[PDB]
């Protein structure tokens, strides 16, 4: 403790112990004063479309978000994880704030002076009782940077509540964040807490070497029969005599099976080649979406399902995949060349393809022409229809979305009467009690009150911000790969050819970039 004593050291490092792995990372942050110290009501603007309305509150507080994997793993560390293991899950984490220093900034005329304010405090709390709206897990930006030498701004905290149109409803909630006991830190003070993840399934870092549709022995016939053929040639004109066959290796589509593919909610298919696509706006009218309370909402990730079938890699689901931006990509209406589209194809083994139906289902009841004095004499015929949406059915197996090093680590399961398979649709680990939110604020410092009493609120404060370092240490459990496969696996490799820049590296201007999404599933398991 003191003005001239460091509150903590720089821990950024990774240790691989062969079962666990610990990834520690430290960054430098900067924390403005948001909303000029005061809460505000926010709502959608006027004639915004019904789908886009909302109501909520913006707060002075900031918050720390490490929820992306690259906040922890490094492109090399990620590669050791991805190539060597069947899966992994998080175990504990530690969090620290330290070397906190608050700066007052003064603007006279065309110059700005910045000086230490030694007595100012920064106040920090974490809500372990989950009593505030949980913003993390919405894939917001403001994470700790991927590259440890970057400095990041701390995001502003805000939340949404019930709305009718742009107007609040009586059940809508207001939360004051100064109503929580919080710790006030002055330069020479530091903040720590630790957290233990609840038991969660390992992520699957493997792809299947088998598909459901071919699960069996080619060499041996089954003992079950299926209906192979319906009518039979009789004289000139055929007649209906139904006959059964016993399914072999040339019948494979007809064999009896114990299991079914995972479920589906279809996507529209768009191609990465702009000339193949239709000329129109289907970006909304053609999109797949649900609605609550009478307002449509696009489904971006959707249920996990494959992005294309064999040799279609040109295509991909309209909304149905995660899309990452390349370094320095603008916010709005940016070209296909400025984005990185993830590819889910490794799951085609089990999950359906997003752009094709689950299957086909019977519709009518067939019959024959033969009747005696009956109006039922017309023979009708067998009919069928494509099933474009399939809810979970008994005997189905599927695979969850992959993780993607610059994608989300976790999400909070909503608190509700029921769930089904609570795995976040963006990917990652669903947690009932996630890592809590760490919230941080610059304490207000009034500026020069008047000499005579006034009961009005203070509108005038010392302008100032703070900065410091933040350190996060997560412990990950590994599931080692045990397989009798003879031939070599597919691995993640950096190209050996010459290049102007090295992948996952700073360029000549110092800008760090990530060239491509790095997935997870490489090592192969049999289904």
Question: Which residues ranging from 200 to 229 are in contact with ligand D5M (CB under 6 A)?
Answer: 200-201
Q: Nearer Cβ to ligand D5M, position 75 or 436?
A: 436
Question: Which region among 231-239, 268-276, 351-359, 416-424 touches ligand D5M (by CB under 6 A)?
Answer: 416-424
Which of ligand D5M, its own copies, none does residue 1 bind (CB under 5 to 8 Å by kind)?
Answer: none
DSSP result, 237-300? S-EEEEEEEE--SS-GGG---S-B---EE---EEESSTTTS-SS--TTTTS-EEEETTEEEE-S
Look at the alpha carbons of 197, 159, 127, 418 in this order and tell me if their dihedral is positive or negative: negative
The least distance separating its own copies from the CB of residue 451, rounded to whole angstroms, comes to 25
Q: Does 275 participate in binding its own copies (rule CB under 8 A)? A: yes
Residues 121 and 102 sit within 8 Å (Cβ to Cβ):
yes
Show the CA angle centred on residue 40, arms to residues 37 and 44, nearest 5°. 145
Q: Does 266 participate in binding its own copies (rule CB under 8 A)? A: yes
Which residues 6+ apart lie within 8 Å of 471 measured at CB?
Answer: 8, 10, 11, 12, 24, 25, 26, 27, 94, 95, 96, 97, 98
Q: Does 456 participate in binding its own copies (rule CB under 8 A)? A: no
Residue pointed to by tokens 């304010």 = 117
Q: Does 419 participate in binding ligand D5M (rule CB under 6 A)? A: yes
Question: Which region among 89-97, 173-181, 442-450 touches its own copies (by CB under 8 A)?
Answer: 173-181
Kindly write out the interface string for residues 305-324 of this chain, putting x where it contacts its own copies by CB under 8 A and - elsewhere. Answer: -x--xxx------xx--xxx
User: Of the candidates 203, 156, 194, 209, which has an alpha carbon nearest to the alpha carbon of residue 405?
Assistant: 203
Restricting to residues 93-112, which ones interact with its own copies according to CB under 8 A? Answer: 99, 101, 106, 108, 111
Of positions 223, 420, 486, 496, contacts ligand D5M by CB under 6 A: 420
Q: Nearer Cβ to its own copies, position 256 or 451?
A: 256
Residue 482: which region, alpha, beta or left (left: phi > 0; alpha: psi -120 to 50)? beta
Q: Which helix (H) or strand (E) holds 57?
A: strand 55-64
Restricting to residues 59-88, which ones interact with ligand D5M according to CB under 6 A? Answer: none
Q: Does 2 participate in binding its own copies (rule CB under 8 A)? A: yes
Which of ligand D5M, its own copies, none does residue 289 bind (CB under 5 to 8 Å by kind)?
Answer: its own copies
Of positions 33, 126, 288, 442, contacts its own copies by CB under 8 A: 288
Helix, strand, or coil (residue 181): coil
- Calculate the alpha carbon distances from 326 to 82, 338, 414 in Å: 22, 6, 32
The least distance separating ligand D5M from the CB of residue 67, rounded to whole angstroms, comes to 14
* Rounded Cα gap, residues 307 and 354, in angstroms: 6
* Rounded Cα gap, residues 444 and 35, in angstroms: 12
Which of ligand D5M, its own copies, none does residue 429 bind (CB under 5 to 8 Å by kind)?
Answer: ligand D5M
Q: Does 462 participate in binding its own copies (rule CB under 8 A)? A: no
* Rounded Cα gap, residues 132 and 436, in angstroms: 10
Q: Nearer Cβ to its own copies, position 90 or 424?
A: 424
User: Of the candidates 58, 64, 83, 60, which has an alpha carbon nearest to the alpha carbon of residue 73?
Assistant: 83
Q: Does 76 participate in binding its own copies (rule CB under 8 A)? A: yes
Q: Does 421 participate in binding ligand D5M (rule CB under 6 A)? A: yes
φ, ψ dihedrals at 50, nearest 5°: -55, -35
What b/e string do you get for 391-412 counting C-beta neighbours within 10 Å, with b at 16 or more?
eeeeebebbbbbbbbbbbbbbb
Q: Which residue is nearest to ligand D5M (CB)?
A: 430
Instruction: Tell me, by CB under 6 A, how many residues bind ligand D5M.
Output: 9
Q: How far apart are the first and last CA of the chain?
A: 57
Two structure tokens written together for 230: 């319906």
Of positions 46, 236, 280, 452, contacts its own copies by CB under 8 A: 280
Of positions 151, 385, 432, 460, contacts its own copies by CB under 8 A: 385
Of positions 285, 450, 452, 454, contacts its own copies by CB under 8 A: 285
User: Of the candidates 345, 362, 361, which has an alpha carbon nearest to the alpha carbon of residue 353?
Assistant: 345
Q: Does 133 participate in binding its own copies (rule CB under 8 A)? A: yes
Of positions 87, 430, 468, 519, contacts ligand D5M by CB under 6 A: 430
Q: Does 391 participate in binding ligand D5M (rule CB under 6 A)? A: no
Q: Which helix (H) or strand (E) holds 468?
A: strand 464-480
Q: Nearer Cβ to ligand D5M, position 208 or 266?
A: 208
Q: Nearer Cβ to ligand D5M, position 422 or 444?
A: 422
The least distance separating ligand D5M from the CB of residue 3, rounded to whole angstroms, comes to 46
Q: Does 420 participate in binding its own copies (rule CB under 8 A)? A: yes
Q: Does 118 participate in binding its own copies (rule CB under 8 A)? A: yes
Which of its own copies, ligand D5M, none does residue 470 bind (CB under 5 to 8 Å by kind)?
Answer: none
Which of ligand D5M, its own copies, none does residue 471 bind (CB under 5 to 8 Å by kind)?
Answer: none
């Amino acid at each position: 403790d003191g003005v001239g004593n460091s509150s903590g050291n720089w821990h950024c490092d990774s240790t691989w112990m062969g079962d666990r792995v610990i990834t520690t990372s430290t960054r430098t942050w900067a924390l403005p004063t948001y909303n000029n110290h005061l809460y505000k009501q926010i709502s959608s603007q006027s004639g915004a479309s019904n789908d886009n309305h909302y109501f909520g509150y913006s707060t002075p507080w900031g918050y720390f978000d490490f929820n992306r994997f690259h906040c922890h793993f490094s492109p090399r560390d990620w590669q050791r994880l991805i190539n060597n293991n069947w899966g992994f899950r998080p175990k504990r984490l530690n969090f620290k704030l330290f070397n906190i220093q608050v700066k007052e900034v003064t603007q006279n005329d065309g110059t700005t002076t910045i000086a230490n304010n030694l007595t100012s405090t920064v106040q920090v709390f974490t809500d372990s009782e989950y009593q505030l709206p949980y913003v993390l897990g919405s894939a917001h930006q403001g994470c700790l940077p991927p590259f440890p030498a970057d400095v990041f701004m701390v995001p502003q905290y805000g939340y949404l509540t019930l709305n009718n149109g742009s107007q609040a409803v009586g059940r809508s909630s207001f939360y004051c964040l100064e109503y929580f006991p919080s710790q006030m830190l002055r330069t020479g003070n530091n903040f720590t807490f630790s957290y233990t993840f609840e038991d969660v399934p390992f992520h699957s870092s493997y792809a299947h070497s088998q598909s459901l549709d071919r699960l069996m022995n080619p060499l041996i016939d089954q003992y079950l029969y299926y209906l192979s053929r319906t009518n039979t040639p009789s004289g000139t004109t055929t007649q209906s005599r139904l006959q059964f066959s016993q399914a072999g290796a040339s019948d494979i589509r007809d064999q009896s099976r114990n299991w079914l593919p995972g479920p589906c909610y279809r996507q529209q298919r768009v191609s990465k080649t702009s000339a193949d696509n239709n000329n129109s706006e289907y970006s909304w009218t053609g999109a797949t979406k649900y609605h609550l309370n009478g307002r449509d909402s696009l489904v971006n990730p959707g249920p996990a399902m494959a992005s294309h079938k064999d040799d279609e890699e040109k295509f991909f689901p309209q909304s149905g995949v995660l899309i990452f931006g390349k370094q320095g990509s603008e916010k709005t209406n940016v070209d296909i060349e400025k984005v990185m589209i993830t590819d889910e194809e490794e799951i085609r083994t089990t999950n359906p393809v997003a752009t094709e139906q689950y299957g086909s289902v019977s519709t009518n009841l067939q019959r024959g022409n033969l009747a005696l004095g009956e109006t039922t004499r017309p023979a009708r015929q067998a009919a069928t229809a494509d099933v474009n949406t399939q809810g979970v059915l008994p005997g189905m197996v599927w695979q969850d979305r992959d993780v993607y090093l610059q994608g989300p680590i976790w999400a909070k399961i909503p608190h509700t009467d029921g769930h089904f398979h609570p795995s976040p649709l963006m990917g990652g680990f669903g947690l009932k009690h996630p890592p809590p939110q760490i919230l941080i604020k610059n304490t207000p410092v009034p500026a020069n009150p008047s000499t005579t009493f006034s009961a009005a609120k203070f509108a005038s404060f010392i302008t100032q911000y703070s900065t410091g370092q933040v350190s996060v240490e997560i412990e990950w459990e590994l599931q080692k790969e045990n397989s009798k496969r003879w031939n070599p696996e597919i691995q993640y490799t950096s190209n050996y050819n010459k290049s102007v820049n090295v992948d996952f590296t700073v360029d000549t201007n110092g800008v760090y970039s990530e060239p491509r999404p790095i997935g997870t599933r490489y090592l192969t398991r049999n289904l």
